Design a binder for this molecule. Structure first.
Ligand SMILES: [Ca+2]
Ligand SMILES: [Ca+2]
Ligand SMILES: [Ca+2]
Ligand SMILES: [Ca+2]
Ligand SMILES: [Ca+2]
Ligand SMILES: [Ca+2]
Ligand SMILES: [Ca+2]
Ligand SMILES: [Ca+2]
Ligand SMILES: [Ca+2]
Lengths: 175, 183
């Protein structure tokens, strides 16, 4: 399934880079509804020699559907086809996430930031504003690993080598 | 001395030289889609690499994983892999040593739990997978074809034989591994 999802990109790499993904997105969207259903997604991949069944399709849509619409919009689809980051880059992030997550339950919260960072604006209200920086656009007081990972998708994309990324992360977080 | 097993040196020489599908099919004189000890023997002579009868039989016996008495494509492809240098063997063992927390010779989910947290994983955050299930999933990749939550050094080595063969220089391979397992 992930192998099928990688063959898609390998195939997209034959010309298509992210502006091309929107172009392909809209050719997948048969009804033009501006989102992809598991059905539309499946028939589109079939046209490319990639085969998975409906339950597999819903599964892929389930994974990338970030707002529980049961469907893939342009943003989610673009995030789906982003070439995954190399493992070394992923490892330093992982590493820095562990640091940040004092409590080590799997998510970073205002409480994890207590003791590590610090009339109007109070204490953890400031701490909350810090948490927000790394959080998604819709702040909910929790930072996942996936979210933390997005926060750095920008600079990572800019930086051409793992060592540039690795060196930066190492110093930022004193790993 | 203890730990040593007797093994044939002249076979190692002939086997090296050889290393340096199209080829398999050439050698498969009788089109059986597998190599007799006898055919392998004749093929190598036709190429100027000399092996007697038992030496050729010895090589089939040791690469014929499934015990068909013969070498098929998968088995032949494996045999031609270059021997693993001290350096590559060293990073593999260091990575295995790291994973095997209990130090009982096998890497299990229980080992892994002391090395990695699986909690931050997206499939755990959605409620669909447990930490141990992500950890088991990770373990399976290194496991033999029959998954049993146990990965032995043999199995670990077998897993990396293929990957190793993919990279040209010891240094690429050593650095890869050092970044993969953070040693
Ligand atoms: Ca649609
Ligand atoms: Ca959606
Ligand atoms: Ca936490
Ligand atoms: Ca969040
Ligand atoms: Ca034959
Ligand atoms: Ca065989
Ligand atoms: Ca163990
Ligand atoms: Ca547990
Ligand atoms: Ca096993």
């Amino acid at each position: 399934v992930d192998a099928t999802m990688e063959k898609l990109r390998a195939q997209c790499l034959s010309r298509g880079g992210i502006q091309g993904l929107a172009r392909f997105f809209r050719q997948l969207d048969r009804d033009g509804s501006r989102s992809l259903d598991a059905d539309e997604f499946r028939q589109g991949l079939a046209k490319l020699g990639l085969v998975l069944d409906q339950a597999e399709a819903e599964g892929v849509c389930r994974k990338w559907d970030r707002n529980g619409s049961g469907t893939l919009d342009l943003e989610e689809f673009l995030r789906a086809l982003r070439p995954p980051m190399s493992q070394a880059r992923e490892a330093v992030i992982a590493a820095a996430f562990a640091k940040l997550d004092r409590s080590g339950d799997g998510v970073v919260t205002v409480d994890d930031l207590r003791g590590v960072y610090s009339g109007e604006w109070t204490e953890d209200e400031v701490l909350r504003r810090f948490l927000d920086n790394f959080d998604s656009s819709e702040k909910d007081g929790q930072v996942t690993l996936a979210e933390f990972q997005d926060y750095y998708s920008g600079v990572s994309a800019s930086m051409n080598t793992d060592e540039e990324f690795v060196a930066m992360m190492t110093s930022a977080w004193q790993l």
